[PDB]
Structures are given as C-alpha cells and as structure tokens.
C-alpha cells in the first residue's frame, strides 16, 4: 500500500548504514509514523502476497495470555518455534503482560479487560493503554517486546489505535505487524459497538536489511491494489471468545509473494 | 516554532470536539509526530515567551529519582504543588520509575544508568528505552505519566531521542515538554561524547482546550524567530551531577508571553 511503499522508499533514500546485533547490516531511519483509515479497507499489503493464518492465530494466542506455544503448535503455527525452549515456553512475553502484568505486591493485571472497561465506561479517557514493556521482566523474556505499547482513542463513534514499535524490519515484519493490530482494532470495535477509526503506526529504529535490497526494489516497482475487506462472521460474547474461523478476507488480490531470507 | 504552529493549526482545522476529565471541552486529534533537528538550535518556542527555570529544576529532580517535592520547594519551583500531599509526596511518578522501577522480585531498576551503559557499550541497540508506564504502580501515582516512555538512537555520531506522549495540552504543556526532553538529549549526548541528533515528539491525544482559542489564534498570528542556542558551561562527571547553573540559553528573542488560564 501507498503508506508502506513510501516508507520503504524513505528508508532507501534517507537511511543510514549500520549493523544489527553482530550480524547483517541495515539502512535505518529513526522515528516514522503512518496512518491507515480502517474505513478505507483492511491494510493487508497488496504489492506482495501475505498470509493471515499465522497472524490470526498469534493474536488469539496473545489474547489468551498463555505464553507457551502449545496452542500455536496444535494449529501448526511455527513462527515462535525458534525462540521457545524445550518445554515450549517463551517467558513473560506479550500475552503475559497483556493479560497478567505482575505487580510488586503479587497481583496480576489484565490490561485487555481494563481497556475494554475504559472503552465502555470512559471512552474519552486519555490513558486507554496496554504496555508490554515490563522493565522488571525483560530478562526473563525470550525476546524484548517489539510492538511495545499501544493506545486507544474514541471520537465520532470510531475506535482508533496507535502502536509504538521500537524496532522494525520494514520488509519482513511490518506487513505482519500492521495486519495484526488492524485485526485487534476491528475486534475491539465490534465488542464495543463502535465503528473502526484509524490505526496509527509509529516506529523507532525502522530498517531494511542489506540482503533484502533486490526484494525491496522489486516490491517498489509494483503498483498497490485496492485493499481487501475484513469480515467478522460472528459477534462473540467477549474479546476472549473469538475463533479462527470467525475471520474472512474479501477481495484480496495481491502481487506474488516475495521471499526474503535471513542470516543466522 | 514552525513544527509547533503547524500542529496547533492542525488541531484547529481537523480536531474533533471532545470533552475531558469532567470539565473543559477540547478540540483533539489522535496521533501526530514532529521532528526537531537539535543541530538547528534549541527548540524553545519563540512565538510566546517561555521560562526554562522550572523546566531545568524539574529535569534535575527527575534524574535524582526522589519524588518528594522538597528539592523543588527549596528552589521555589511550584509546578508539582497541586498534586503533592501534605508531606510533599507524589507517589512513584516519573523519577521513581526512571531510577528505581520496582520489579516483582524486590529489585529496583535504574533505567537511566542502563541507557547510559547501552549508549557506551552498544550504541546500535534497538532497545535503549526508558519507560515510566509502570502498570503495577499507576494507582499509587498522584498522576499517570504523560510523557510515558522514550527511546534513544545513535547514528553518524549523533544521539536522537523519540518520546511518546499519551496526552498533550498543545498550548500550555507542549512547549515545556519539548524543551525538557531537548535538554535531556543534550545532557546525555555530552556524557557520551556524541553530537545531538533529532528529538522526535510523538503524541497520542493531542488537544487544545476550548478556553484557549483566542490565545491560540494570537500565537498563530506571530512569526517564529530564529531558535536560541543551548550552552552547557561544564561537563559533569556523570548524568547525575548536573547543576542548575550549568545551563545557559543564548540568543533567545521571543514574542511576549501569553497567559492561558485553567478551570478547576
Ligand atoms: O518466524 C517467522 O517466519 C515468517 C517467515 C516467512 C518466510 C521467510 O523466508 C522467513 Br525468513 C520468515 C513466517 C510468517 C508466516 C508464516 O505462516 C510462517 Br510459517 C513464517 C515471518 C514473516 C513475516 C513476519 C514474521 C514475524 Cl513479524 C515474526 C516471525 C516470522 C515472520
Ligand atoms: O503547574 C504548572 O504551571 C505553569 C503555568 C503557568 C501559567 C499559567 O497561567 C498556568 Br494555568 C500554569 C507554570 C510554568 C512555569 C512556571 O515557572 C510556573 Br510557576 C508555572 C505551566 C506552564 C506550562 C506547562 C506546565 C506543565 Cl507541562 C506542567 C505544570 C505547569 C505548567
Ligand atoms: O513484530 C516484529 C518482530 C521482530 N521484528 C524484527 C525487528 C528486528 O529486525 C529484529 C529484532 O532485532 P532487535 O530489535 O531486537 O534488536 O526482528 C520486526 O520488525 N517486527
Ligand atoms: O507534560 C505534560 C503534563 C500534562 N499535560 C496535560 C495533558 C492533559 O492536558 C492534562 C492531563 O489529562 P489526562 O491525560 O490525565 O486525562 O494535562 C501535558 O500536556 N503535558
Ligand atoms: O493463505 C492466505 C491468503 C490470503 C489471505 C490469508 C491467507 Br492465510
């Protein structure tokens, strides 16, 4: 899509050359922001084929708060395999913080229920926030949260959300990340009887890996196509009762997929 | 400043009529970002006179990590008076989280020292972050953090920083907030022997109060003037050893101050 391709081009034109944790070099920029009016269509990249299966399962998995990959495995979703230990545990990553942020006094805070309580009883609140950046638990996590913190906003009967992504691989991760949060907004909006507003993506270290340059130029040579439409075939009794089959993408006609390998 | 006036105009043209904490109505937008190349001069608004005295004392106070207002009072800084209790305590706000974030196991994490350690040993890290959004301690704070978290970035020998502000009164608080963080970047850069890069400001609920409309129109009618230059007269042995007198602003020639009252 337009916003995405503009960012890719920006990284190419303005990015500075610098490596990553003892590894592949990158071109990076710091601080960028894109806005997607969800009423204009579901923001699933069209300049390359993207699959939503893993994205949907991962989101349902996050919402359940259990950080063991068992559920992902039961559905043959392997995106977290390289980070899980022999027992399938990842430590207190995303889901754990979203649903059970541990306090110093022994309590566990359900931020998702909190946000829903706020959207229902105090929609104009300026602190409808969910943070996964639990400083005291970073060392126990298989990896530090990338999509670290998001905030909701309501105006004119529409639900908007802004995500702060501290680090972003523009080619591989960004499309996935945008789709994931767009889905969450639709789900939250359905549960609150609200229309969807804007999804605002804000990035920190936004980069392109040196070995994805040809892939980037190829995708930039393609014209974005009309965005698909997200359909939720059922209204669950709560944000925790959604099922994989409840989602359907309509009118998605992307260009062919583009493979982008990674170093180890 | 150009960026600041543009945001102010944006709120006026695109803002939605939204009410706030049972009180004064506002015009608000959600999600915006501004960039200040600190190499172009210190970002202290010139379309209205702004005083840095309280801003400097508050930052030094944040860095010391003590949340009692005693130090502020010793220097006749009264900006936190309305939120402090009879003993002058504010609960675990900003400073406490920056310097002693409590973990579930009883430890207290010094995020400022952590960040300095990162800038010195691993400047390319994509997780040089400080967060004041401690979910488990929000209820104990006099007020929920507004400038909720920030991230540093290093490229070409320059230090940049991006702040996420969840809520922002564009007229009264923003100028203060921008100056505060710009000062922090200068201090951090001096300690790490780096040049100053960009300060990126990202906002959540960005608004203008209905009773500040005349004041806004007045400031918008004024032409911004060349930005001043920040001078640090001494290089302390550490980020915690700065003193009020170490700072000096050169070439600040602003338009007259504009008073903006608040309801109670
Ligand atoms: O670990 C991943 O893997 C894939 C991946 C795909 C092809 C490829 O060449 C490489 Br490298 C990686 C991924 C994505 C969806 C899937 O259904 C499967 Br399976 C795998 C992936 C693509 C895009 C974003 C991803 C993010 Cl944000 C996290 C983890 C993965 C990830
Ligand atoms: O609590 C404040 O007060 C002042 C303030 C000034 C005039 C006025 O009409 C009203 Br209302 C409030 C402020 C600012 C600097 C000072 O030296 C002193 Br004293 C007071 C203020 C101005 C701009 C930003 C502020 C922020 Cl972000 C926090 C707290 C204050 C604050
Ligand atoms: O949702 C995600 C998850 C991971 N990554 C990327 C970011 C970096 O490319 C790499 C992680 O490196 P660090 O930021 O942790 O240093 O994986 C993303 O872009 N988006
Ligand atoms: O650094 C600061 C501190 C406070 N405020 C403002 C934001 C809102 O105008 C009000 C706080 O309202 P809530 O976000 O808490 O609802 O004070 C700022 O703009 N900047
Ligand atoms: O395989 C797919 C194709 C299009 C959209 C989602 C999936 Br998953």
| Residue B143 DSSP symbol | S
Task: Classify the phi-psi angles of B171: left when phi > 0, otherwise alpha if psi is within -120 to 50, otherwise beta.
Answer: alpha
Tell me the CATH number of domain A2-264, given options 3.40.50.620, 1.10.730.10, 3.30.572.10, 1.10.287.610: 3.30.572.10
Rounded to whole angstroms, how far apart are CA atoms B221 and B13? 15
Query: How distant is the alpha carbon of residue B2 from its chain centre?
Result: 18
B206 neighbors B146 (Cβ within 8 angstroms): no
Nearest residue on chain A to B160, judged by CA atoms?
A30
Mutate to test the pocket of ligand 5, among A43, A50, A55, A257 (most ligand atoms within 8 A of CB): A50
Distance CA A130, CA A114 (A): 9
Indicate the DSSP class of residue B212. Answer: G
Interface touch B20/A124, C-beta < 8 Å = yes
Closest CA to A41 of A141, A134, A179: A179
DSSP state of A68: B
Strands A147-155 and A158-169: antiparallel
Assigned token pair, B156: 């070409």
Neighbours of B188 (CB within 10 A): 20
Chain B interface mutation, best of A21, A204, A207, highest count of B Cβ atoms under 10 Å: A204
Cα(A79) to centroid of ligand 1, in Å? 6
Residue pair B209/B167 in contact by the 8 Å Cβ criterion: no
Q: Where are the domains of chain B?
A: 2-264
* 3-state secondary structure (DSSP) of residue B104: coil
User: What gap in Å lies between CA B264 and CA B257, rounded to an integer?
Assistant: 22
- Cα of B143 vs centre of ligand 4, distance in Å, is 9
The reply, when asked if residue A168 is annotated as ligand binding, is yes
CB B205 within 8 A of CB B28: yes
Rounded Cα distance, B1 and B175, in Å: 10
Please return the burial class of B128, using the count of CB atoms within 10 Å of its CB with bins 0-12, 13-18 and 19+.
Answer: buried
* CB contact (8 A) between residue A131 and residue B135: yes
**Sign of the alpha-carbon dihedral angle for B96, B101, B104, B106:** negative
**B35-64 burial, b if ≥16 CB within 10 A, otherwise e?**
ebebeebbbbbbbbebebebbbbbbbbbbe
Nearest CA to A35 among A47, A44, A43?
A43
* Three-point CA angle B171, B172, B175, nearest 5°: 80
Q: b vs e for B197-229, b when ≥16 Cβ sit within 10 Å of the residue's Cβ?
A: bbbbbbbbbbbbbeebeebbeebeeeebeebbe
Pairing of strands B129-131, B147-155: antiparallel
Place of tokens 């084929």: A49
Shortest alpha-carbon distance between residue B171 and chain A (Å): 17
Q: Which long-range contacts (CB under 8 A, 24 or more apart) does A8-11 make?
A: A8/A170, A8/A171, A8/A208, A8/A216, A8/A219, A8/A220, A9/A220, A11/A170, A11/A206, A11/A207, A11/A208
The span from the CA of B216 to the CA of B84, in Å, is 30
Taking the alpha carbons of B16, B20, B25, B28 in that order, is the dihedral positive or negative? Answer: negative
């Amino acid at each position: 899509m337009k916003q995405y391709l503009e960012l890719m081009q920006k990284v190419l034109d303005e990015g500075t050359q610098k490596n990553d944790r003892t590894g592949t070099g990158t071109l990076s920029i710091f601080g960028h922001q894109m806005r997607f009016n969800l009423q204009d269509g579901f923001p699933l990249v069209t300049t390359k084929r993207c699959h939503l299966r893993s994205i949907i399962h991962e989101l349902l998995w996050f919402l359940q708060g259990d950080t063991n990959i068992a559920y992902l495995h039961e559905n043959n979703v392997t995106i977290w395999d390289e980070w899980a230990d022999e027992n399938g545990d990842l430590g207190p990553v995303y889901g754990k913080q979203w649903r059970a942020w541990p306090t110093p006094d022994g309590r566990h805070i359900d931020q998702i229920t909190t946000v829903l309580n706020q959207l229902k009883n105090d929609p104009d609140s300026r602190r409808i926030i969910v943070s996964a950046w639990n400083v005291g638990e970073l060392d126990k996590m298989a990896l530090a949260p990338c999509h670290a913190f998001f905030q909701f906003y309501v105006a004119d009967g529409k639900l908007s959300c802004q995500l702060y992504q501290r680090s972003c691989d523009v080619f591989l991760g960004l499309p996935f990340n945008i789709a994931s949060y767009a889905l969450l907004v639709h789900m939250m909006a359905q549960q609150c009887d609200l229309e969807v507003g804007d999804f605002v993506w804000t990035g920190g270290d936004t980069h392109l890996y040196s070995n994805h340059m040809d892939q980037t130029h190829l995708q930039l040579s393609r014209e974005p196509r009309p965005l698909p439409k997200l359909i939720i075939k059922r209204k669950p009794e709560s944000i925790f009762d959604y099922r994989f089959e409840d989602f359907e993408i309509e009118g998605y006609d992307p260009h062919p997929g583009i493979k982008a390998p990674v170093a180890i």
